């Protein structure tokens, strides 16, 4: 099994790492609910240390799936409503265009366009949208950056504390960090730009909610299992996790959940390519609200991409089929090439 399974992965990942010169990758597979992690290559070109079970990768915007889960949990406990306006938690913004943006619009990339906290409030005050809220989908770290900020306000806690002392241990993610600890800096892989220059993360404002997660393939895989209800999460978090699969908007070929993005399953490859295409990532796509929102639906392909300066991430799973993939690379891999490999690999199962 693991032999056949590893061969299936290797036939995709080895040429990928070859053509794009990725020093290392960690691949997580759920095959009929069984998890597997397959490590390839090295953590750092200067130290040649190999990718192992504890190697940390930056997952970029896949971080936002965990932020969305936290916000969904707050909603489940009555601490917030996704329909709440930002101005509810930032009273100064009442009267300002951003004060009416809802938490839902931040978690769906539809708010209407895009140092210290006083300056952040200064930035949000002067912010003038290009579109009315909830009508156009436009990828942005300010939207989900603010989703995590506002959820922490509602939950009466520091953001990073909520992630490391609440969410991560409740999934049993024991090698997942917003702030990587000193004893763990040795596990942190080195990223590499498209040139080959080594790089790790620059931490702007709202850096933790939007892209602050470093993690292992095993831990991200366990999250994927939790998103298919497989690992005995407590009832409030389990409901919270499933509710992030609610379908809120159509945007071209893509359906926008809370941060997650989904497609009907079975899914044709052109559907995934079009939904993960650069046009989705950079343009302001008209987004039509789904009324009533789609209930979470096991017969879907649910995925999310992540890209930092030095790392490439992809996550995709099908709850009805009980399969999923996690791909972590410490180099730059074209999004559509992550998509194609996942589609071929998962099609093998």
């Amino acid at each position: 099994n693991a032999d056949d399974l590893r061969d299936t992965v290797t036939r995709q990942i080895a040429p990928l790492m070859k053509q794009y010169a990725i020093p290392g990758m960690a691949i997580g597979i759920v095959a009929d609910g069984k998890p597997y992690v397959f490590d390839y290559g090295v953590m750092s070109k200067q130290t040649g240390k190999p990718v192992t079970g504890d190697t940390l990768f930056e997952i970029g915007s896949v971080s936002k799936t965990l932020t969305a889960t936290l916000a969904s949990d707050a909603q489940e406990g009555g601490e917030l409503s996704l329909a709440d306006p930002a101005g509810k938690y930032l009273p100064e913004l009442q009267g300002k265009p951003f004060g009416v943006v809802t938490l839902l619009q931040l978690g769906t990339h539809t708010p209407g366009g895009t140092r210290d906290d006083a300056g952040l409030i200064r930035y949000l005050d002067a912010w003038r949208p290009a579109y009315a809220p909830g009508t156009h989908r436009k990828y942005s770290n300010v939207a989900i950056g603010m989703l995590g900020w506002l959820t922490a306000k509602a939950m009466h806690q520091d953001f990073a504390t909520l992630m490391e002392q609440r969410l991560f241990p409740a999934i049993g993610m024991t090698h997942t960090y917003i702030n990587v600890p000193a004893a763990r800096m040795a596990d942190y892989a080195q990223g590499y730009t498209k040139d080959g220059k080594p790089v790790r993360m620059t931490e702007g404002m709202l850096w933790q909610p939007a892209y602050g997660v470093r993690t292992t393939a095993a831990d991200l895989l366990r999250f994927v299992q939790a998103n298919m209800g497989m690992i005995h999460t407590a009832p409030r978090l389990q409901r919270a996790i499933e509710r992030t699969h609610t379908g809120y908007f159509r945007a071209g070929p893509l359906t926008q959940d809370l941060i997650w993005e989904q497609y009907p399953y079975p899914v044709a490859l052109p559907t995934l390519l079009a939904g993960n295409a650069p046009k989705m990532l950079f343009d302001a796509v008209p987004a039509s609200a789904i009324q009533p929102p789609l209930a979470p639906n096991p017969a879907t392909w649910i995925n999310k991409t992540g890209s930092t300066g030095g790392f490439s991430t992809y996550v995709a799973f099908v709850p009805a089929k009980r399969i999923g993939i996690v791909m972590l690379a410490n180099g730059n891999v074209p999004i559509e090439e992550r998509v194609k490999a996942a589609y071929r690999i998962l099609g093998s199962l």
Side-chain angles (χ1 to χ4, degrees):
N1 288 258
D3 288 23
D4 291 276
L5 181 48
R6 204 192 154 94
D7 302 348
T8 303
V9 167
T10 303
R11 297 194 228 98
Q12 305 295 319
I13 294 314
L16 246 220
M17 304 174 54
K18 192 182 186 298
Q19 191 204 346
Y20 297 109
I22 309 304
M25 297 195 67
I27 317 295
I29 291 294
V30 173
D32 199 55
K34 272 282 160 58
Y36 304 85
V37 175
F38 306 113
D39 290 328
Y40 299 85
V42 288
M43 298 182 41
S44 171
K45 271 180 179 186
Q46 178 259 314
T47 89
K49 187 162 66 176
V51 174
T52 57
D54 299 338
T55 294
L56 296 164
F57 300 81
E58 316 169 356
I59 62 175
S61 294
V62 181
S63 303
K64 314 165 174 184
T65 63
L66 293 150
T67 303
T69 302
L70 186 75
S72 188
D73 187 79
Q75 198 276 332
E76 279 305 294
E79 314 189 59
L80 62 80
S81 162
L82 292 183
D84 292 343
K88 177 184 186 179
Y89 304 105
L90 296 179
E92 303 211 38
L93 302 185
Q94 300 170 5
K96 262 56 252 317
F98 196 82
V100 306
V101 177
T102 60
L103 280 53
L104 189 59
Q105 289 151 7
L106 299 173
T108 60
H109 312 293
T110 54
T114 23
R115 351 268 27 91
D116 52 7
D117 291 343
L120 169 62
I121 299 295
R122 284 195 244 105
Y123 166 60
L124 297 169
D125 250 277
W127 173 81
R128 299 299 179 261
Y131 297 101
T135 65
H136 290 71
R137 183 182 181 281
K138 174 62 181 296
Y139 211 70
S140 164
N141 288 323
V142 169
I144 168 70
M146 282 307 300
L147 182 64
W149 229 62
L150 297 164
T151 300
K153 276 285 181 181
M155 298 186 84
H156 319 286
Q157 187 55 266
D158 175 74
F159 175 80
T161 300
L162 284 166
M163 299 290 273
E164 304 187 336
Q165 309 302 327
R166 205 188 156 72
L167 181 64
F168 300 162
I171 320 265
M173 304 172 70
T174 63
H175 285 283
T176 302
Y177 312 104
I178 297 300
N179 301 118
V180 178
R184 300 289 177 275
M185 278 307 314
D187 301 340
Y188 194 161
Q190 173 77 238
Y192 294 98
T193 61
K194 307 177 164 62
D195 293 18
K197 300 146 80 171
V199 62
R200 284 185 193 93
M201 247 179 52
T202 71
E203 301 169 333
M205 190 54 49
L206 291 314
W207 72 270
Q208 340 177 277
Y211 51 90
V213 177
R214 272 56 64 94
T215 183
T216 67
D219 274 15
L220 205 46
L221 193 56
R222 192 167 179 81
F223 186 48
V224 168
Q225 296 182 266
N227 274 268
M228 302 187 287
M230 294 165 171
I231 57 161
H232 311 155
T233 82
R236 174 178 164 188
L237 179 55
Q238 186 69 86
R239 299 191 295 265
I241 287 171
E242 194 180 10
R243 219 161 154 94
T244 74
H245 305 179
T246 298
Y248 292 108
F249 294 95
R250 313 292 183 182
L254 170 155
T255 299
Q256 182 63 64
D257 306 347
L258 198 64
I259 295 301
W260 292 110
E261 309 151 0
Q262 80 182 201
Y263 309 87
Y265 186 86
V267 49
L269 180 58
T271 293
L272 300 176
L273 305 172
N276 296 107
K279 169 190 286 76
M280 293 304 308
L281 275 82
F282 302 104
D283 299 357
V285 184
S288 44
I290 306 178
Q291 307 154 336
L294 308 164
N297 178 10
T300 46
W301 174 291
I302 305 168
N303 67 0
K304 180 74 191 80
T305 43
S307 294
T308 62
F311 296 78
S312 295
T313 313
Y314 186 60
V315 175
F317 58 100
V318 181
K321 296 266 277 188
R322 304 178 62 254
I323 59 190
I325 187 168
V326 168
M327 303 170 47
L328 319 180
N330 65 342
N332 280 241
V333 180
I335 281 166
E336 308 280 27
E337 287 300 325
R338 325 172 199 172
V339 173
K340 293 179 214 160
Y343 193 79
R344 302 181 188 114
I345 289 167
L346 287 196
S348 310
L349 306 179

PDB file of all heavy atoms in Angstrom, residues 196-222:
ATOM      1  N   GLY A 196      16.399  31.265  -6.635  1.00  0.00           N
ATOM      2  CA  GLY A 196      17.223  30.427  -5.792  1.00  0.00           C
ATOM      3  C   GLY A 196      17.765  31.140  -4.576  1.00  0.00           C
ATOM      4  O   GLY A 196      18.457  30.512  -3.765  1.00  0.00           O
ATOM      5  N   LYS A 197      17.479  32.425  -4.429  1.00  0.00           N
ATOM      6  CA  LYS A 197      17.927  33.167  -3.263  1.00  0.00           C
ATOM      7  C   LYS A 197      17.169  32.681  -2.033  1.00  0.00           C
ATOM      8  O   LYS A 197      15.941  32.529  -2.085  1.00  0.00           O
ATOM      9  CB  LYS A 197      17.720  34.664  -3.489  1.00  0.00           C
ATOM     10  CG  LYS A 197      18.491  35.194  -4.698  1.00  0.00           C
ATOM     11  CD  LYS A 197      17.752  36.315  -5.442  1.00  0.00           C
ATOM     12  CE  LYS A 197      17.903  37.674  -4.753  1.00  0.00           C
ATOM     13  NZ  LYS A 197      17.373  38.826  -5.560  1.00  0.00           N
ATOM     14  N   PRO A 198      17.851  32.397  -0.933  1.00  0.00           N
ATOM     15  CA  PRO A 198      17.161  31.918   0.260  1.00  0.00           C
ATOM     16  C   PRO A 198      16.397  33.036   0.938  1.00  0.00           C
ATOM     17  O   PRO A 198      16.815  34.196   0.940  1.00  0.00           O
ATOM     18  CB  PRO A 198      18.301  31.417   1.148  1.00  0.00           C
ATOM     19  CG  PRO A 198      19.452  32.248   0.748  1.00  0.00           C
ATOM     20  CD  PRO A 198      19.301  32.506  -0.724  1.00  0.00           C
ATOM     21  N   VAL A 199      15.273  32.664   1.543  1.00  0.00           N
ATOM     22  CA  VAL A 199      14.359  33.653   2.096  1.00  0.00           C
ATOM     23  C   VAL A 199      13.436  32.978   3.103  1.00  0.00           C
ATOM     24  O   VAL A 199      13.063  31.818   2.942  1.00  0.00           O
ATOM     25  CB  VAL A 199      13.568  34.342   0.960  1.00  0.00           C
ATOM     26  CG1 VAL A 199      12.720  33.327   0.198  1.00  0.00           C
ATOM     27  CG2 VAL A 199      12.724  35.462   1.497  1.00  0.00           C
ATOM     28  N   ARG A 200      13.110  33.706   4.171  1.00  0.00           N
ATOM     29  CA  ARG A 200      11.962  33.388   5.008  1.00  0.00           C
ATOM     30  C   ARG A 200      11.112  34.643   5.119  1.00  0.00           C
ATOM     31  O   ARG A 200      11.333  35.619   4.392  1.00  0.00           O
ATOM     32  CB  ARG A 200      12.364  32.865   6.384  1.00  0.00           C
ATOM     33  CG  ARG A 200      12.842  31.423   6.392  1.00  0.00           C
ATOM     34  CD  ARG A 200      13.115  30.941   7.801  1.00  0.00           C
ATOM     35  NE  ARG A 200      13.859  29.686   7.829  1.00  0.00           N
ATOM     36  CZ  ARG A 200      15.183  29.598   7.901  1.00  0.00           C
ATOM     37  NH1 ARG A 200      15.920  30.698   7.950  1.00  0.00           N
ATOM     38  NH2 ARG A 200      15.770  28.409   7.922  1.00  0.00           N
ATOM     39  N   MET A 201      10.177  34.648   6.051  1.00  0.00           N
ATOM     40  CA  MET A 201       9.066  35.592   6.027  1.00  0.00           C
ATOM     41  C   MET A 201       9.330  36.993   6.557  1.00  0.00           C
ATOM     42  O   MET A 201       9.958  37.173   7.604  1.00  0.00           O
ATOM     43  CB  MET A 201       7.922  35.001   6.836  1.00  0.00           C
ATOM     44  CG  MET A 201       6.711  34.624   6.055  1.00  0.00           C
ATOM     45  SD  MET A 201       5.512  33.886   7.374  1.00  0.00           S
ATOM     46  CE  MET A 201       5.541  35.348   8.666  1.00  0.00           C
ATOM     47  N   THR A 202       8.812  37.981   5.834  1.00  0.00           N
ATOM     48  CA  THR A 202       8.725  39.345   6.335  1.00  0.00           C
ATOM     49  C   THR A 202       7.330  39.556   6.906  1.00  0.00           C
ATOM     50  O   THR A 202       6.332  39.247   6.246  1.00  0.00           O
ATOM     51  CB  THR A 202       9.012  40.377   5.238  1.00  0.00           C
ATOM     52  OG1 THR A 202       7.934  40.405   4.297  1.00  0.00           O
ATOM     53  CG2 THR A 202      10.292  40.049   4.503  1.00  0.00           C
ATOM     54  N   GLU A 203       7.264  40.088   8.127  1.00  0.00           N
ATOM     55  CA  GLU A 203       6.024  40.138   8.904  1.00  0.00           C
ATOM     56  C   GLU A 203       5.443  41.549   8.899  1.00  0.00           C
ATOM     57  O   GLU A 203       5.727  42.360   9.781  1.00  0.00           O
ATOM     58  CB  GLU A 203       6.277  39.661  10.325  1.00  0.00           C
ATOM     59  CG  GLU A 203       6.827  38.251  10.423  1.00  0.00           C
ATOM     60  CD  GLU A 203       7.309  37.915  11.826  1.00  0.00           C
ATOM     61  OE1 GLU A 203       7.691  38.855  12.555  1.00  0.00           O
ATOM     62  OE2 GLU A 203       7.303  36.721  12.207  1.00  0.00           O
ATOM     63  N   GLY A 204       4.580  41.826   7.925  1.00  0.00           N
ATOM     64  CA  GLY A 204       3.856  43.080   7.890  1.00  0.00           C
ATOM     65  C   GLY A 204       2.790  43.127   8.972  1.00  0.00           C
ATOM     66  O   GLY A 204       2.761  42.327   9.906  1.00  0.00           O
ATOM     67  N   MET A 205       1.898  44.101   8.840  1.00  0.00           N
ATOM     68  CA  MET A 205       0.772  44.198   9.764  1.00  0.00           C
ATOM     69  C   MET A 205      -0.319  43.232   9.309  1.00  0.00           C
ATOM     70  O   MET A 205      -0.454  42.971   8.108  1.00  0.00           O
ATOM     71  CB  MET A 205       0.252  45.637   9.843  1.00  0.00           C
ATOM     72  CG  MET A 205      -0.777  45.917  10.947  1.00  0.00           C
ATOM     73  SD  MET A 205      -0.262  45.415  12.772  1.00  0.00           S
ATOM     74  CE  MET A 205       1.510  46.224  12.848  1.00  0.00           C
ATOM     75  N   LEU A 206      -1.087  42.701  10.265  1.00  0.00           N
ATOM     76  CA  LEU A 206      -2.007  41.599   9.998  1.00  0.00           C
ATOM     77  C   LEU A 206      -1.271  40.416   9.381  1.00  0.00           C
ATOM     78  O   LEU A 206      -1.818  39.704   8.538  1.00  0.00           O
ATOM     79  CB  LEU A 206      -3.165  42.022   9.087  1.00  0.00           C
ATOM     80  CG  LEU A 206      -4.270  42.982   9.541  1.00  0.00           C
ATOM     81  CD1 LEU A 206      -4.792  42.602  10.906  1.00  0.00           C
ATOM     82  CD2 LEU A 206      -3.817  44.427   9.522  1.00  0.00           C
ATOM     83  N   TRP A 207      -0.016  40.206   9.778  1.00  0.00           N
ATOM     84  CA  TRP A 207       0.751  39.101   9.209  1.00  0.00           C
ATOM     85  C   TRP A 207       0.327  37.762   9.784  1.00  0.00           C
ATOM     86  O   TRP A 207       0.382  36.745   9.088  1.00  0.00           O
ATOM     87  CB  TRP A 207       2.248  39.298   9.457  1.00  0.00           C
ATOM     88  CG  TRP A 207       2.666  39.077  10.891  1.00  0.00           C
ATOM     89  CD1 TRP A 207       2.713  40.015  11.890  1.00  0.00           C
ATOM     90  CD2 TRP A 207       3.093  37.838  11.484  1.00  0.00           C
ATOM     91  NE1 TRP A 207       3.141  39.435  13.063  1.00  0.00           N
ATOM     92  CE2 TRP A 207       3.384  38.102  12.840  1.00  0.00           C
ATOM     93  CE3 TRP A 207       3.259  36.533  10.998  1.00  0.00           C
ATOM     94  CZ2 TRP A 207       3.826  37.105  13.718  1.00  0.00           C
ATOM     95  CZ3 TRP A 207       3.705  35.549  11.871  1.00  0.00           C
ATOM     96  CH2 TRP A 207       3.980  35.841  13.213  1.00  0.00           C
ATOM     97  N   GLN A 208      -0.058  37.732  11.052  1.00  0.00           N
ATOM     98  CA  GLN A 208      -0.449  36.465  11.664  1.00  0.00           C
ATOM     99  C   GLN A 208      -1.738  35.915  11.075  1.00  0.00           C
ATOM    100  O   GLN A 208      -1.765  34.725  10.709  1.00  0.00           O
ATOM    101  CB  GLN A 208      -0.560  36.637  13.179  1.00  0.00           C
ATOM    102  CG  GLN A 208       0.189  37.833  13.711  1.00  0.00           C
ATOM    103  CD  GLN A 208       0.000  38.011  15.195  1.00  0.00           C
ATOM    104  OE1 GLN A 208      -0.994  38.586  15.641  1.00  0.00           O
ATOM    105  NE2 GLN A 208       0.952  37.512  15.977  1.00  0.00           N
ATOM    106  N   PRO A 209      -2.827  36.689  10.947  1.00  0.00           N
ATOM    107  CA  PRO A 209      -4.074  36.083  10.462  1.00  0.00           C
ATOM    108  C   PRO A 209      -4.038  35.721   8.992  1.00  0.00           C
ATOM    109  O   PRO A 209      -4.766  34.811   8.582  1.00  0.00           O
ATOM    110  CB  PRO A 209      -5.131  37.165  10.743  1.00  0.00           C
ATOM    111  CG  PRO A 209      -4.469  38.182  11.599  1.00  0.00           C
ATOM    112  CD  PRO A 209      -3.023  38.121  11.244  1.00  0.00           C
ATOM    113  N   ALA A 210      -3.215  36.390   8.189  1.00  0.00           N
ATOM    114  CA  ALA A 210      -3.270  36.211   6.745  1.00  0.00           C
ATOM    115  C   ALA A 210      -2.283  35.170   6.234  1.00  0.00           C
ATOM    116  O   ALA A 210      -2.589  34.457   5.274  1.00  0.00           O
ATOM    117  CB  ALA A 210      -3.022  37.551   6.046  1.00  0.00           C
ATOM    118  N   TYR A 211      -1.106  35.061   6.850  1.00  0.00           N
ATOM    119  CA  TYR A 211      -0.098  34.143   6.311  1.00  0.00           C
ATOM    120  C   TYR A 211       0.921  33.715   7.358  1.00  0.00           C
ATOM    121  O   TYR A 211       2.028  33.320   6.979  1.00  0.00           O
ATOM    122  CB  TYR A 211       0.625  34.793   5.129  1.00  0.00           C
ATOM    123  CG  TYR A 211       1.172  36.181   5.419  1.00  0.00           C
ATOM    124  CD1 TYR A 211       2.462  36.359   5.933  1.00  0.00           C
ATOM    125  CD2 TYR A 211       0.404  37.316   5.170  1.00  0.00           C
ATOM    126  CE1 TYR A 211       2.966  37.638   6.189  1.00  0.00           C
ATOM    127  CE2 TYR A 211       0.894  38.590   5.427  1.00  0.00           C
ATOM    128  CZ  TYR A 211       2.172  38.749   5.932  1.00  0.00           C
ATOM    129  OH  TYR A 211       2.642  40.020   6.178  1.00  0.00           O
ATOM    130  N   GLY A 212       0.600  33.782   8.644  1.00  0.00           N
ATOM    131  CA  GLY A 212       1.581  33.587   9.687  1.00  0.00           C
ATOM    132  C   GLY A 212       1.865  32.160  10.082  1.00  0.00           C
ATOM    133  O   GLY A 212       2.706  31.948  10.957  1.00  0.00           O
ATOM    134  N   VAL A 213       1.216  31.173   9.465  1.00  0.00           N
ATOM    135  CA  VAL A 213       1.333  29.794   9.928  1.00  0.00           C
ATOM    136  C   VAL A 213       2.571  29.138   9.330  1.00  0.00           C
ATOM    137  O   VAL A 213       2.787  29.155   8.110  1.00  0.00           O
ATOM    138  CB  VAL A 213       0.069  28.981   9.600  1.00  0.00           C
ATOM    139  CG1 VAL A 213       0.269  27.551  10.037  1.00  0.00           C
ATOM    140  CG2 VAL A 213      -1.147  29.569  10.291  1.00  0.00           C
ATOM    141  N   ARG A 214       3.393  28.570  10.207  1.00  0.00           N
ATOM    142  CA  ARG A 214       4.405  27.585   9.871  1.00  0.00           C
ATOM    143  C   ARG A 214       3.943  26.251  10.439  1.00  0.00           C
ATOM    144  O   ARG A 214       3.406  26.206  11.549  1.00  0.00           O
ATOM    145  CB  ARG A 214       5.759  27.975  10.461  1.00  0.00           C
ATOM    146  CG  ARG A 214       6.623  28.882   9.583  1.00  0.00           C
ATOM    147  CD  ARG A 214       5.947  30.185   9.160  1.00  0.00           C
ATOM    148  NE  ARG A 214       5.632  31.074  10.271  1.00  0.00           N
ATOM    149  CZ  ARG A 214       6.420  32.053  10.698  1.00  0.00           C
ATOM    150  NH1 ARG A 214       7.590  32.271  10.120  1.00  0.00           N
ATOM    151  NH2 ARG A 214       6.039  32.814  11.712  1.00  0.00           N
ATOM    152  N   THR A 215       4.117  25.168   9.685  1.00  0.00           N
ATOM    153  CA  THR A 215       3.570  23.888  10.129  1.00  0.00           C
ATOM    154  C   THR A 215       4.257  22.749   9.387  1.00  0.00           C
ATOM    155  O   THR A 215       5.044  22.965   8.461  1.00  0.00           O
ATOM    156  CB  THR A 215       2.042  23.841   9.935  1.00  0.00           C
ATOM    157  OG1 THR A 215       1.518  22.604  10.440  1.00  0.00           O
ATOM    158  CG2 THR A 215       1.677  23.979   8.466  1.00  0.00           C
ATOM    159  N   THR A 216       3.958  21.527   9.824  1.00  0.00           N
ATOM    160  CA  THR A 216       4.437  20.307   9.193  1.00  0.00           C
ATOM    161  C   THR A 216       3.357  19.718   8.295  1.00  0.00           C
ATOM    162  O   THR A 216       2.179  20.073   8.383  1.00  0.00           O
ATOM    163  CB  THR A 216       4.839  19.255  10.228  1.00  0.00           C
ATOM    164  OG1 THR A 216       3.674  18.819  10.933  1.00  0.00           O
ATOM    165  CG2 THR A 216       5.830  19.819  11.207  1.00  0.00           C
ATOM    166  N   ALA A 217       3.775  18.779   7.441  1.00  0.00           N
ATOM    167  CA  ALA A 217       2.810  18.102   6.588  1.00  0.00           C
ATOM    168  C   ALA A 217       1.834  17.293   7.420  1.00  0.00           C
ATOM    169  O   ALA A 217       0.634  17.265   7.125  1.00  0.00           O
ATOM    170  CB  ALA A 217       3.519  17.206   5.577  1.00  0.00           C
ATOM    171  N   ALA A 218       2.329  16.642   8.474  1.00  0.00           N
ATOM    172  CA  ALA A 218       1.449  15.856   9.331  1.00  0.00           C
ATOM    173  C   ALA A 218       0.351  16.724   9.937  1.00  0.00           C
ATOM    174  O   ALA A 218      -0.827  16.357   9.913  1.00  0.00           O
ATOM    175  CB  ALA A 218       2.264  15.166  10.426  1.00  0.00           C
ATOM    176  N   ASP A 219       0.716  17.889  10.474  1.00  0.00           N
ATOM    177  CA  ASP A 219      -0.273  18.725  11.151  1.00  0.00           C
ATOM    178  C   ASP A 219      -1.308  19.262  10.173  1.00  0.00           C
ATOM    179  O   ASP A 219      -2.512  19.249  10.464  1.00  0.00           O
ATOM    180  CB  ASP A 219       0.415  19.878  11.878  1.00  0.00           C
ATOM    181  CG  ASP A 219       0.884  19.498  13.276  1.00  0.00           C
ATOM    182  OD1 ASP A 219       0.945  18.294  13.606  1.00  0.00           O
ATOM    183  OD2 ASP A 219       1.200  20.418  14.049  1.00  0.00           O
ATOM    184  N   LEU A 220      -0.863  19.747   9.013  1.00  0.00           N
ATOM    185  CA  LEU A 220      -1.812  20.212   8.007  1.00  0.00           C
ATOM    186  C   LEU A 220      -2.707  19.069   7.544  1.00  0.00           C
ATOM    187  O   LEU A 220      -3.906  19.257   7.310  1.00  0.00           O
ATOM    188  CB  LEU A 220      -1.062  20.829   6.827  1.00  0.00           C
ATOM    189  CG  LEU A 220      -1.836  21.858   6.011  1.00  0.00           C
ATOM    190  CD1 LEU A 220      -2.530  22.825   6.951  1.00  0.00           C
ATOM    191  CD2 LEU A 220      -0.905  22.606   5.084  1.00  0.00           C
ATOM    192  N   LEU A 221      -2.143  17.868   7.439  1.00  0.00           N
ATOM    193  CA  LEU A 221      -2.941  16.703   7.082  1.00  0.00           C
ATOM    194  C   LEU A 221      -4.002  16.426   8.137  1.00  0.00           C
ATOM    195  O   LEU A 221      -5.143  16.090   7.807  1.00  0.00           O
ATOM    196  CB  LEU A 221      -2.032  15.487   6.900  1.00  0.00           C
ATOM    197  CG  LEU A 221      -2.690  14.282   6.234  1.00  0.00           C
ATOM    198  CD1 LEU A 221      -3.261  14.691   4.869  1.00  0.00           C
ATOM    199  CD2 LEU A 221      -1.685  13.145   6.107  1.00  0.00           C
ATOM    200  N   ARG A 222      -3.640  16.550   9.416  1.00  0.00           N
ATOM    201  CA  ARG A 222      -4.606  16.297  10.480  1.00  0.00           C
ATOM    202  C   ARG A 222      -5.759  17.291  10.412  1.00  0.00           C
ATOM    203  O   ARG A 222      -6.913  16.935  10.666  1.00  0.00           O
ATOM    204  CB  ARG A 222      -3.902  16.346  11.834  1.00  0.00           C
ATOM    205  CG  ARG A 222      -4.736  15.818  12.970  1.00  0.00           C
ATOM    206  CD  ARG A 222      -3.910  15.575  14.226  1.00  0.00           C
ATOM    207  NE  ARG A 222      -4.751  15.076  15.314  1.00  0.00           N
ATOM    208  CZ  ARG A 222      -5.125  13.806  15.448  1.00  0.00           C
ATOM    209  NH1 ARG A 222      -4.730  12.904  14.569  1.00  0.00           N
ATOM    210  NH2 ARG A 222      -5.895  13.439  16.460  1.00  0.00           N
TER     211      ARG A 222
END
